[PDB]
Symmetry: C2
Subunit: 198 residues, 2 copies
């Protein structure tokens, strides 16, 4: 069924913004676990065939006794599958969604300022997102491994703010992590996800 | 006076090699400090400005519903870690009232640890694992984020912070290794003190 996807550029491609140690453990351990437990949950169910997008959209209809496992692990798999593809070494701060973000916030810096505040504000483990919601842009956060897909909002950019993704380098300084993040945001893809959005 | 982040009962390097010295410094001076601050800010000239944190956290729904979320999160923060520092101990000794009463319910300390470890490991995202007194009965629960068993009317006599910030520097992804090490620095002299005062 579900497979851990290969990192597009290896572990050192986001230096010095995200450390090379964190990338290997995040990918090889944290994500790997999500995939193993997810496969264990759906192995032998009607879910086994279907895509993680379809499943995370439909958590409410996932059978009782595996709903938690799928939410947590299905989400972990989707969330991190997007993250890897959304981090770029040759990030160019331009394209469709950036045009569309300047059209909605006035400037990219006024967007970042909100995103950063919502990212910093999410108490405990969670993600910060920019989502396409009924054609409009919205900045929402989720706790743990929850994904706005579950609430009919297509995510086009996400940031893991679990401490396991920033603590080796930035320790308690989550802001520095969010600031740094921008340097490796892969807008070529953030676009790709806006186009396919429904 | 309100609230002030308390000194560790020991040095930062006093729990080595079980909890790293870098983590003991940041965890207390930053993480627990920020809580005290953001908390003090939220209670700036209020009904609970001069109330005990044990009272506030156990009566959380009756906190003005416009600062409720900040107090629950930073209030829990202050109490949880305040407990955690006192419940840690260079020279723990596995005996006393709670150890005898654990033996009485679980059959053995090792059976108790196994459940605590499983429940501690199982807690998804950030939170705490607790041994609490629930109406005289002993019970192992976990709570998300900075929530405390007091809010549900159970007194905590032992707590383990399983936020990734409390173990990632040394143990990284391997939370179970951290839970295992914890047992070497649990302060059963304090666990008793807290149980005794369940009264
Ligand atoms: Mn993660
Ligand atoms: Mn903590």
């Amino acid at each position: 069924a579900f497979e851990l996807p290969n990192l597009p550029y290896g572990f050192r491609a986001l230096e010095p913004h995200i450390d090379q140690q964190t990338m290997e453990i995040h990918h090889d351990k944290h994500h790997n676990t999500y995939v193993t437990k997810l496969n264990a949950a759906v192995e032998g169910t009607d879910l086994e065939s279907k895509s993680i997008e379809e499943i995370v959209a439909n958590l409410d209809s996932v059978p009782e006794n595996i709903q938690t496992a799928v939410r947590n692990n299905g989400g972990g798999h989707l969330n991190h599958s997007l993250f890897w593809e959304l981090l770029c070494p040759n990030s160019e701060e331009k394209g469709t969604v950036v045009d569309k973000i300047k059209e909605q916030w006035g400037s990219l810096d006024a967007f970042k300022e909100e995103f950063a505040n919502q990212a910093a504000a999410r108490f405990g483990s969670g993600w910060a997102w920019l989502v396409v919601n009924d054609g409009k842009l919205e900045i929402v956060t989720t706790p743990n491994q929850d994904n706005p897909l579950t609430e009919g909002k297509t995510p086009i950019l996400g940031l893991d703010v679990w401490e396991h993704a920033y603590y080796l380098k930035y320790q308690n300084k989550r802001p520095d992590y969010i600031s740094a993040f921008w340097n490796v945001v892969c807008w070529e893809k953030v676009d790709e996800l806006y186009n396919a959005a429904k």
